[PDB]
Structure 1
Amino acid sequence: MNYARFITAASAARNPISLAGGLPNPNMFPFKTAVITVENGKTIQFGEEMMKRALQYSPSAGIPELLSWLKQLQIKLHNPPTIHYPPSQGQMDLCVTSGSQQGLCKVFEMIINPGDNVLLDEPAYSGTLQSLHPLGCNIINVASDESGIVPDSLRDILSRWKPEDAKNPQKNTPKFLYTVPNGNNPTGNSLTSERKKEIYELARKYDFLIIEDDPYYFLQFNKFRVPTFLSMDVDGRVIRADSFSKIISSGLRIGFLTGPKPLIERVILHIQVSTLHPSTFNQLMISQLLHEWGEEGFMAHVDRVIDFYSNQKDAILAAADKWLTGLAEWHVPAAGMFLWIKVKGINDVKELIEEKAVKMGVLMLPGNAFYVDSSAPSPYLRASFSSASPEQMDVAFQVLAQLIKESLLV
């Protein structure tokens, strides 16, 4: 594998008793000791020495024990083929980020030169669209559905090029394909094992990278979790983004990238000149807890959380059924925390949200946000079952429905 091709010139030009130590004196920091309790788990303690560790600078790719525990999990969950490959051949490498957004952004940054082609299915994450836009890439939209990206659409799109063209600079082959394989923001649609095989196979034929942005992986209502692109990455073409935001803490800013050693190493260098490293305090906070828990301790917690949002999914749907009677259309969310609604008989919905819905104390995101062309009208809504109560959901839909009707009288 040649990683140099997928890389931007600036990325490749990146570069890595002691008085050398450009670190401040630890004994000069005000916060002396910490005690953090955990429900259905033990108690975390940050003693004098542990606190001095937590308050001082850290490795950059992450704290050693957080990186080891995560490495163990990535193998124990995806057993990536790349595990024992030579580094140059795309050997599996991990990297702790200050949220999964840091991982993705840095990856996009290290890949995209203005003019480069990117494969992505619309509607896609606002944050990533927002990331790629200033970057200068051409987003080629790949046709999706309830089961995700249609391998056939990707198959048709790729037919523009020849499988040899990937080797040829002068031929602008797609640098990567971007997907949310489980519970896509904003649709909530998840891919299938079959389709993923077809897509990976397509990635091989046309030789492009796959950035697997999977934050709602642990939040699968599916029962037996579907195998990942990383879990099937023979070549070493997968950059996989995991998040602790949806299960452990969004505020702590601790995410984790898993991909080929050369590519991960390219992001690590960028973070060296950007944030230096993620909060050593929070990395230790996560580490210590999920260490004393174990993989069983972790999997119990994940199950506990999936069955909360399962009822939240059940709840919002039990509401949509009641109030969106036949005023809109929706797919049962596969995973994650979003319900994606198609308001029947209306071209644009943005108006009757930030002007009609808000004044009614109900607010949910218009679909416009999830498209490259934000100007073009959307009859879509993205409703979050992450927080609102069944009562709240009921009171929310009863409003929304009212508004759907008024605009139907125009």
Structure 2
Amino acid sequence: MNYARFITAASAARNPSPIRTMTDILSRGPKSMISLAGGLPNPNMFPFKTAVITVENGKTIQFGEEMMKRALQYSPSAGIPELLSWLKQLQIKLHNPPTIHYPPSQGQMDLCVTSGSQQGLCKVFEMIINPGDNVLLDEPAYSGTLQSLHPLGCNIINVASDESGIVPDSLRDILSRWKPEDAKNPQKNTPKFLYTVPNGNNPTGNSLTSERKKEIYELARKYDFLIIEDDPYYFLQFNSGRVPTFLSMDVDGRVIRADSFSKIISSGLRIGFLTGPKPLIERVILHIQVSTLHPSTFNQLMISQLLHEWGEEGFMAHVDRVIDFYSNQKDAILAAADKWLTGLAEWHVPAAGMFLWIKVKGINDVKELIEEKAVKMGVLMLPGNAFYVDSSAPSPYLRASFSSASPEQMDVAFQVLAQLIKESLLVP
């Protein structure tokens, strides 16, 4: 593939740090080397000495004197080597990407640890988007993505979707305005990429099927666009097993995948990872180098130590317990919606994640009913407006999270909503 056409002039202009050549020559010189090269501060000046972190339950992560000095010091831009190698093997085990052994220039599978998956996505959007470029996505979409794309000056083209996510026939119809050969044409503006959240879309809770992913991938090949697979709910699917990902079917090296530890390990530690073709991942790493430099070494070492002790089996057993908890939370929110909202609202059973997307029946805009009337009654939900490119347009939808509230709290919240629907209906 020609990666240069999916890279801005600014992104292509990025050069590596002078410390890259120094690290490459460090592995080509003697063993007992003296370095006065790096701008590394003295680790003995740091006030934190050792650390003990207890793990669920009875287990213990310990940072001795030397490990603590490493944790408090600068580390590689793409992430610590032990976390990268464990994650690489996880990706091979979970997705077996076709690109593992491709030459670097042909999109060889590459990884980098990011400060949450949001950082990876942002660098990816900034690497690709020139003002006026065309991008594809299905609305309602994650507000963070829309807020990230809005300043970039791109035209966002909405792809139709249903309970099984993106409708491939709608994507087929949209793309028919171009001819496949337009992707090679400098005077044509064929879409740079398709962005999607394939499992438990934020805010709908809907997931793509394997069949639909195969059809979407074939259209991405035909019109030569990238697939940005933002999958933070991959490890939060309600069904047993896992639907094959876009990365698993990536024969062309056209998929950039974002994974997150936010919903399973910790959101506050800011650790996620990007998997994709080496020429694109390299552009992202060069941008990280001049911004955050690297993700927290301390946080990476905590997660790396946990993952190595658990192994892939202990990791998957932990995700299984997390899924079990969210599955019960999902049943409790569905039971509250059944009790109070039957006849008043419409909702689908979410396939993954932590949200219930509710459509209020005889109301055009839910914003004032929620942002004002519901708050006064002691209940807060998110109005749907925030999940569309045109956020000023009226929305009868609301997003309700089932991650934290108790069944009794959900019952209170839904009873209130039901009376406010009956209130906004009897108004002349």
TM superposition score category, shorter chain reference: over 0.9
Work out the CA distance in 1 between the residues paired with 2:37 and 2:323: 48
Judged with a 3 Å threshold, the aligned counterparts in structure 2 of structure 1 residues 86 and 314 are, in CA distance, closer, same or farther, namely same
Describe the SS at the equivalent of 1:345.
coil
Work out the CA distance in 2 between the residues paired with 1:326 and 1:36: 50
Contact residue 338 and residue 385 of structure 1 kept, 8 A: yes
Describe the SS at the equivalent of 2:35.
coil
Contact residue 221 and residue 335 of structure 1 kept, 8 A: yes
User: Could you list the runs of 5+ residues in structure 1 that have no partner in the other structure?
Assistant: none
User: Could you list the runs of 5+ residues in structure 2 that have no partner in the other structure?
Assistant: 16-33
Deviations 1:2-57 (A, max 9, x none): 10001100000000x11111010000000011000001462100000000000000
Deviations 1:59-85 (A, max 9, x none): 110000000000000000000000000
Contact residue 214 and residue 240 of structure 1 kept, 8 A: yes
Work out the CA distance in 2 between the residues paired with 1:198 and 1:360: 47
- Cα distance, 1:376 vs structure 2: 0.4
Contact residue 329 and residue 343 of structure 1 kept, 8 A: yes
Work out the CA distance in 1 between the residues paired with 2:304 and 2:165: 34
Q: RMSD across aligned C-alpha pairs, in angstroms?
A: 0.6
Q: Report whether the alignment pairs 1:361 with 2:392.
A: no
Q: Report whether the alignment pairs 1:248 with 2:265.
A: yes
Contact residue 183 and residue 189 of structure 1 kept, 8 A: yes
Contact residue 97 and residue 257 of structure 1 kept, 8 A: yes
- Cα distance, 1:360 vs structure 2: 1.4
Work out the CA distance in 2 between the residues paired with 1:28 and 1:267: 32
Describe the SS at the equivalent of 1:170.
coil
Work out the CA distance in 2 between the residues paired with 1:222 and 1:135: 37
- Cα distance, 1:292 vs structure 2: 0.4
Q: Report whether the alignment pairs 1:202 with 2:219.
A: yes
- 1:180 maps to which of 191, 197, 215: 197
Work out the CA distance in 1 between the residues paired with 2:190 and 2:333: 42
Work out the CA distance in 1 between the residues paired with 2:93 and 2:151: 38
Work out the CA distance in 2 between the residues paired with 1:361 and 1:44: 41
Q: Report whether the alignment pairs 1:339 with 2:353.
A: no
Work out the CA distance in 2 between the residues paired with 1:196 and 1:337: 22
Describe the SS at the equivalent of 1:172.
coil
| Residue in structure 1 matched with residue 9 of structure 2 by the alignment | 9
Work out the CA distance in 1 between the residues paired with 2:343 and 2:328: 23
Work out the CA distance in 2 between the residues paired with 1:376 and 1:78: 39
Task: Name the stretch that deviates more: 356-365 or 6-15.
Answer: 356-365
Describe the SS at the equivalent of 2:183.
coil
Contact residue 41 and residue 293 of structure 1 kept, 8 A: no
Work out the CA distance in 2 between the residues paired with 1:41 and 1:317: 35
Deviations 1:292-322 (A, max 9, x none): 0001100110000000000000000010000
Task: Name the stretch that deviates more: 39-48 or 64-73.
Answer: 39-48
Describe the SS at the equivalent of 1:298.
helix
Work out the CA distance in 1 between the residues paired with 2:58 and 2:73: 27
| Residue in structure 2 matched with residue 79 of structure 1 by the alignment | 96
Please report the TM-score for the alignment, with normalisation by the length of structure 2: 0.95
Work out the CA distance in 2 between the residues paired with 1:211 and 1:45: 37
Please report the TM-score for the alignment, with normalisation by the length of structure 1: 0.99
Work out the CA distance in 1 between the residues paired with 2:200 and 2:188: 34
- Structure 1 consecutive aligned stretches of length 4 or more whose deviation exceeds 6 Å: none
Describe the SS at the equivalent of 1:37.
strand
- Cα distance, 1:224 vs structure 2: 2.1
- Cα distance, 1:384 vs structure 2: 0.2
Alignment of 1:11-50 (within 5 A): 11-15=11-15, 17-40=34-57, 42-50=59-67
- Cα distance, 1:361 vs structure 2: 1.3
| Residue in structure 2 matched with residue 114 of structure 1 by the alignment | 131
| Residue in structure 2 matched with residue 321 of structure 1 by the alignment | 338
Work out the CA distance in 2 between the residues paired with 1:226 and 1:247: 18
| Residue in structure 1 matched with residue 86 of structure 2 by the alignment | 69
Describe the SS at the equivalent of 2:227.
strand
Deviations 1:78-106 (A, max 9, x none): 00000000001100000100000000000
| Residue in structure 2 matched with residue 217 of structure 1 by the alignment | 234
Work out the CA distance in 1 between the residues paired with 2:338 and 2:163: 19
Deviations 1:136-178 (A, max 9, x none): 1000000000000000000000001000000001000000000
Contact residue 360 and residue 399 of structure 1 kept, 8 A: yes
Contact residue 94 and residue 257 of structure 1 kept, 8 A: yes
Work out the CA distance in 2 between the residues paired with 1:333 and 1:131: 25
| Residue in structure 2 matched with residue 393 of structure 1 by the alignment | 410
Work out the CA distance in 2 between the residues paired with 1:40 and 1:151: 45
Work out the CA distance in 1 between the residues paired with 2:216 and 2:252: 13
Work out the CA distance in 2 between the residues paired with 1:261 and 1:367: 37
